[PDB]
Amino acid sequence: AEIYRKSAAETFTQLEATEKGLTTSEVTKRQEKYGFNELKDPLWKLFLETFKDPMVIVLVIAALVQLVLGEVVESLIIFLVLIVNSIISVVQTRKAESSLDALREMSAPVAKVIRDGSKQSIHARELVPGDVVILDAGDFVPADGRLFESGSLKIDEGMLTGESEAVEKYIDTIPDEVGLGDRVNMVFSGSLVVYGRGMFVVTGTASETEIGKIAGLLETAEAKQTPLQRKLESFSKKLGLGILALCVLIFAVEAGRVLLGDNSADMATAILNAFMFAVAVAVAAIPEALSSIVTIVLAVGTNKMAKQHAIIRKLPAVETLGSTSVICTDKTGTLTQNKMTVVDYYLPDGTKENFPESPENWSEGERRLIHIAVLCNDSNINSEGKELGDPTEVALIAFSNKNNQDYNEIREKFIREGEIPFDSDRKLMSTLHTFNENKAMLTKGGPDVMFARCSYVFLDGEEKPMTEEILAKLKETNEEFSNQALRVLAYGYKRMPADTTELKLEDEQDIVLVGLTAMIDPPREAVYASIEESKKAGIRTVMITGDHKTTAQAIGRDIGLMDADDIALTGQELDAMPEEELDKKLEHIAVYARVSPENKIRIVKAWQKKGKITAMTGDGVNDAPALKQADIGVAMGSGTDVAKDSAAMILTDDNFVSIVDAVGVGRTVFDNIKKSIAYLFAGNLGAIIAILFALVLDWINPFTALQLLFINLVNDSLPAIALGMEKAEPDVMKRKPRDINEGIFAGGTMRAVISRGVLIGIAVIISQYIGMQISPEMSVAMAFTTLILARTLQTFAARSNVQTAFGAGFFSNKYVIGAVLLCFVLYGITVLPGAREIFSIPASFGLHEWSIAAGLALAAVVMMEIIKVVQNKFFKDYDIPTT
Ligand SMILES: CCCCCCCC/C=C\CCCCCCCC(=O)OC[C@H](COP(=O)(O)OCC[N+](C)(C)C)OC(=O)CCCCCCC/C=C\CCCCCCCC
Ligand SMILES: CCCCCCCC/C=C\CCCCCCCC(=O)O[C@H](COC(=O)CCCCCCC/C=C/CCCCCCCC)COP(=O)(O)OCC[N+](C)(C)C
Numbered sequence: 099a100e101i102y103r104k105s106a107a108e109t110f111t112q113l114e115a116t117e118k119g120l121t122t123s124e125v126t127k128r129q130e131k132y133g134f135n136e137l138k139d140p141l142w143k144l145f146l147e148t149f150k151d152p153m154v155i156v157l158v159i160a161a162l163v164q165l166v167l168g169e170v171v172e173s174l175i176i177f178l179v180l181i182v183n184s185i186i187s188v189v190q191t192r193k194a195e196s197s198l199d200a201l202r203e204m205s206a207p208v209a210k211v212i213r214d215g216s217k218q219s220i221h222a223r224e225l226v227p228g229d230v231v232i233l234d235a236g237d238f239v240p241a242d243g244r245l246f247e248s249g250s251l252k253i254d255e256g257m258l259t260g261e262s263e264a265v266e267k268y269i270d271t272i273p274d275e276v277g278l279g280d281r282v283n284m285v286f287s288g289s290l291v292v293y294g295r296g297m298f299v300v301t302g303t304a305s306e307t308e309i310g311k312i313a314g315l316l317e318t319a320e321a322k323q324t325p326l327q328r329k330l331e332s333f334s335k336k337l338g339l340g341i342l343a344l345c346v347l348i349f350a351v352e353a354g355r356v357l358l359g360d361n362s363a364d365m366a367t368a369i370l371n372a373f374m375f376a377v378a379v380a381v382a383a384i385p386e387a388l389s390s391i392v393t394i395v396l397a398v399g400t401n402k403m404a405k406q407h408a409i410i411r412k413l414p415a416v417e418t419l420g421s422t423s424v425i426c427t428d429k430t431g432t433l434t435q436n437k438m439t440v441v442d443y444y445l446p447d448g449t450k451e452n453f454p455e456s457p458e459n460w461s462e463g464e465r466r467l468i469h470i471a472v473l474c475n476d477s478n479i480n481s482e483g484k485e486l487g488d489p490t491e492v493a494l495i496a497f498s499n500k501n502n503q504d505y506n507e508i509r510e511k512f513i514r515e516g517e518i519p520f521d522s523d524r525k526l527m528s529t530l531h532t533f534n535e536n537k538a539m540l541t542k543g544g545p546d547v548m549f550a551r552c553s554y555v556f557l558d559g560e561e562k563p564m565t566e567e568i569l570a571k572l573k574e575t576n577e578e579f580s581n582q583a584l585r586v587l588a589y590g591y592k593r594m595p596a597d598t599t600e601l602k603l604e605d606e607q608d609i610v611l612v613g614l615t616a617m618i619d620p621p622r623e624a625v626y627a628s629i630e631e632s633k634k635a636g637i638r639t640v641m642i643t644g645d646h647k648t649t650a651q652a653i654g655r656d657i658g659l660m661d662a663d664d665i666a667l668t669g670q671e672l673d674a675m676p677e678e679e680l681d682k683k684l685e686h687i688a689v690y691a692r693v694s695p696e697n698k699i700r701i702v703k704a705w706q707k708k709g710k711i712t713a714m715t716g717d718g719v720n721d722a723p724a725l726k727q728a729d730i731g732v733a734m735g736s737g738t739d740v741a742k743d744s745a746a747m748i749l750t751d752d753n754f755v756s757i758v759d760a761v762g763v764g765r766t767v768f769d770n771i772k773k774s775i776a777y778l779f780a781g782n783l784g785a786i787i788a789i790l791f792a793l794v795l796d797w798i799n800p801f802t803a804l805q806l807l808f809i810n811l812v813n814d815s816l817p818a819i820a821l822g823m824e825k826a827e828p829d830v831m832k833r834k835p836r837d838i839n840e841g842i843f844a845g846g847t848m849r850a851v852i853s854r855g856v857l858i859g860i861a862v863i864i865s866q867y868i869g870m871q872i873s874p875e876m877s878v879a880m881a882f883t884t885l886i887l888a889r890t891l892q893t894f895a896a897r898s899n900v901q902t903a904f905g906a907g908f909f910s911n912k913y914v915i916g917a918v919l920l921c922f923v924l925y926g927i928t929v930l931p932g933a934r935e936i937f938s939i940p941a942s943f944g945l946h947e948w949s950i951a952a953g954l955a956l957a958a959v960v961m962m963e964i965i966k967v968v969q970n971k972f973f974k975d976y977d978i979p980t981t
């Protein structure tokens with residue numbers, strides 16, 4: 099933090115310390131100022147905040163009224179569903195608290211400090227600003243500080259930039275302001291030293307470090323409300339107000355009837371009927387099993403994602419994946435596989451589009467290029483498949499193995515007879531080999547230092563290079579590779595005296611050049627198709643990487659996010675933009691490059707500020723704040739534990755196409771939830787229509803609270819779940835993300851609910867009337883029969899809004915068939931001689947009256963299918979039915 103622009107001396111005078119260390123008294127004094135070098139809503143009376151839900155208020159009042167009326171067991175049943183669904187909400191809030199853990203067991207446990215004039219190892223938590231720390235290879239950087247002594251020091255800063263490659267450190271003052279990854283004279287707590295010796299003065303400990311800033315970012319990330327959760331809140335308020343209006347109307351009708359009517363009835367009988375009708379409508383309108391059924395449908399979605407090795411922690415998260423509009427992705431490790439890979443090559447004697455795959459189909463230039471790439475390196479791959487060596491060198495033996503040439507056969511056939519190690523100030527490596535009684539020296543390295551030592555080229559024979567069209571073409575192709583962000587290596591050999599047994603450093607001149615290679619961190623194979631798949635779904639994909647701008651533009655230009663000559667925003671350029679300017683430039687970036695961990699969480703917050711449900715995919719500590727802040731965080735299975743604990747879905751097999759698949763799965767989840775809710779309320783609406791009609795005509799209440807509770811809880815639970823198991827619709831994933839403000843009955847579902855409900859109600863009204871011709875008790879049995887059987891049979895009509903049961907496949911959904919058969923068993927249980935008076939079914943209720951009621955239910959469901967088929971064959975633009 100602006101320390102890297104100062105010299106070591108200025109930083110020393112700022113911390114009031116020298117390079118010979120601190121004394122014990124000064125260290126104790128600074129420990130009181132700074133503290134030790136370490137990091138550091140939920141409450142179970144929230145069970146009371148579950149009682150702010152209107153449906154809960156309605157059911158609590160209905161339960162108390164029934165308590166007063168003497169209906170105790172149905173009051174107890176209501177209290178059971180209340181207690182249960184409340185704990186269904188508490189289990190959704192409690193687990194999110196262990197996501198607020200910030201488990202940093204990756205901090206360094208030891209510090210190698212100079213104190214009192216003596217080098218000693220201390221607990222790293224005891225470090226303080228001004229301490230002089232020594233770094234050696236394999237040590238973990240214990241605190242942030244400014245280097246003042248470096249001996250070829252190289253550190254892995256993959257926790258801040260996402261790149262596991264070691265960066266070289268230098269003690270020089272950085273004159274200009276550069277991004278966080280390019281702070282060459284700064285070391286950061288949490289990183290791992292790879293090579294060299296170092297010595298730095300601590301400038302930051304505890305939460306005043308870059309990793310401490312990451313911990314603070316994780317802390318501030320607060321959970322969002324789910325789109326389904328918002329839709330259900332708004333609908334619950336509407337249902338509560340409506341029910342309150344119906345109850346006021348019930349008391350109004352009862353009071354006007356006793357006031358402006360026949361004196362026969364009592365005030366007591368009228369007030370009791372008013373209460374019974376109000377409680378009946380209250381229970382009938384509320385789908386008491388809704389949150390439970392929704393949980394089961396969500397579970398089916400998360401299991402379908404689990405078969406693809408995508409483990410979703412929270413159940414509602416799968417539905418949120420369906421409403422995704424922006425997918426922010428990290429590059430290294432996420433879009434790619436963090437695997438250096440040969441992608442292009444150049445041979446002067448003919449370059450092909452792709453390198454051939456038969457080792458015997460190759461040209462002599464191709465076989466010599468492969469032999470030099472394999473024999474001039476020390477990397478290896480064992481039988482298990484573990485890679486050992488520099489990833490640049492493992493890229494070459496992986497290239498040979500990819501093209502059906504086992505690198506081991508070449509290492510076994512040509513043995514190493516002498517080597518020159520790779521020098522830093524002489525980026526070059528040579529090995530000595532005997533090729534069919536001819537000794538040769540193989541040599542490889544970067545084109546800049548290799549062209550200066552090449553005096554021959556391998557075209558047809560061994561030929562001297564002319565500057566025009568040979569060296570100029572080589573430099574043309576090298577800089578063309580650099581424009582595409584490719585690491586280039588030049589290869590060559592030298593025929594050697596047959597008496598040589600060792601290589602000398604004076605023998606690395608007049609080399610015969612063979613060819614060139616170009617390697618990059620390539621995207622995953624499924625990335626191209628997934629990005630196109632998400633574009634068809636109305637999903638914007640943004641790339642947020644800590645890698646360099648050139649690499650981040652080359653990729654992204656390759657995966658279909660950037661056209662040629664499109665620029666990527668940098669963390670340096672981003673930190674200088676205020677939020678208002680970023681709000682106006684946010685929708686026109688596609689790639690951010692070389693960003694800090696705070697930049698990612700800032701972009702994700704900005705996209706959420708646009709109102710978009712955002713997903714963030716990542717694999718490292720630099721993504722963790724953005725993974726926790728995002729609406730849905732997806733971590734790579736091969737990523738760090740910090741990002742996995744911060745994410746909501748984890749791709750165990752690193753299968754990138756799972757993300758888009760999750761969106762597709764999520765979309766069908768919500769579609770099926772909509773189906774189930776529409777199925778549930780269509781039944782409730784039919785019940786309300788039957789009760790209110792019985793009210794305005796002064797009939798007996800067609801239903802009992804115990805009957806309504808039994809239908810809404812036991813009979814209608816399996817059919818709603820079965821509707822939850824419905825196949826994905828054909829044109830899903832061709833659709834745009836749903837609006838968050840969209841209602842839960844939007845898009846023809848409201849029309850479907852009212853049509854099916856009115857039909858069920860008319861069926862119950864006619865059924866109750868027919869039963870009313872015998873006795874009031876017979877009318878209750880027939881109204882209950884028609885209601886429960888029309889709700890059972892409606893499942894066929896509720897499977898789809900645009901397709902009859904016979905059309906989709908009458909047996910295409912086997913869970914619906916089993917559900918209807920099981921509900922028939924339920925209705926049969928209600929008429930068993932023991933449970934008849936329980937369900938208010940008189941002894942005289944026979945197969946004749948049952949036949950009439952069941953026929954009415956079946957006729958109503960046939961009318962639902964007829965109305966649907968007329969609506970979708972003749973009014974198919976905006977589906978609306980008539981007849
Ligand atoms: C094995 C593979 C199939 C699995 C699925 C189904 C399995 C479930 C079957 C049974 C479960 C146990 C229920 C059995 C006991 C009930 C039968 C019964 O005890 O019956 C006798 C009574 C009355 O007998 P009664 O009138 O002679 O005496 C009248 C004289 N008095 C007035 C003096 C009484 O009857 C009544 O209570 C009327 C009760 C009728 C029960 C029918 C239940 C079927 C449910 C749905 C059918 C689908 C409807 C489709 C539309 C049909 C259009 C017509
Ligand atoms: C079914 C019929 C229902 C009708 C009955 C009506 C009464 C029901 C009332 C309470 C039921 C008690 C069961 C609570 C579940 C355990 C809570 C839990 O386990 O959470 C606690 C979580 O702590 C917290 O974070 C703070 C929240 C504390 C919860 C306090 C709950 C206390 C309940 C008080 C009821 C007050 C009524 C007093 C009446 C006295 C009249 C005689 C347990 O933390 P811990 O320290 O024990 O160990 C933790 C070890 N770790 C974290 C590794 C798992």
Ligand code: BEF
Pocket residue numbers: 259260261428429430431432642643644645718720
């Ligand atoms: F690993 Be990411 F590209 F920062």
Ligand SMILES: [Mg+2]
Pocket residue numbers: 260261428429430431432716717718
């Ligand atoms: Mg990464």
